């Protein structure tokens, strides 16, 4: 037996991203995540998108 | 006796702006106000920064 995933994942956009989409045409994933790490100064995020 | 302000009112950058300044060369003042009133769907805004 193998414990394979049973469901497709999802990647819902954050509302803050939508303001950054309407203006300049670019989107970085998890915009709230980077904001909380620049304040602490930590460079290594736990996870990526 | 005209009532004139006794002190300069300093502007301050929002923490959300700190990532936007790095990822691209632009800043939207009151960026949290844009996200709040855009997610609300209301075309108008209270006051400018």
UniProtKB/Swiss-Prot annotation, chains A, B:
Superkingdom of the source species: Viruses
UniProt subcellular location: Virion; Host nucleus
Quaternary structure and partners: Homomultimer. Makes the hexons and eleven out of twelve pentons. Interacts with triplex proteins 1/TRX1 and 2/TRX2; adjacent capsomers are linked together in groups of three by triplexes, heterotrimeric complexes composed of one molecule of TRX1 and two molecules of TRX2. Interacts with scaffold protein; this interaction allows efficient MCP transport to the host nucleus. Interacts with capsid vertex component 2/CVC2. Interacts with the small capsomere-interacting protein/SCP.
Function: Self-assembles to form an icosahedral capsid with a T=16 symmetry, about 200 nm in diameter, and consisting of 150 hexons and 12 pentons (total of 162 capsomers). Hexons form the edges and faces of the capsid and are each composed of six MCP molecules. In contrast, one penton is found at each of the 12 vertices. Eleven of the pentons are MCP pentamers, while the last vertex is occupied by the portal complex.
Family designation: Belongs to the herpesviridae major capsid protein family.
Protein known as: Major capsid protein
Organism, scientific name: Human cytomegalovirus (strain AD169)
């Amino acid at each position: 037996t193998v414990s394979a995933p049973a469901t497709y994942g999802n990647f819902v956009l954050s509302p803050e991203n939508a303001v950054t989409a309407i203006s300049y045409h670019s989107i970085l994933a998890d915009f709230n995540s980077y904001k909380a790490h620049l304040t602490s100064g930590q460079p290594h995020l736990p996870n990526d998108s």
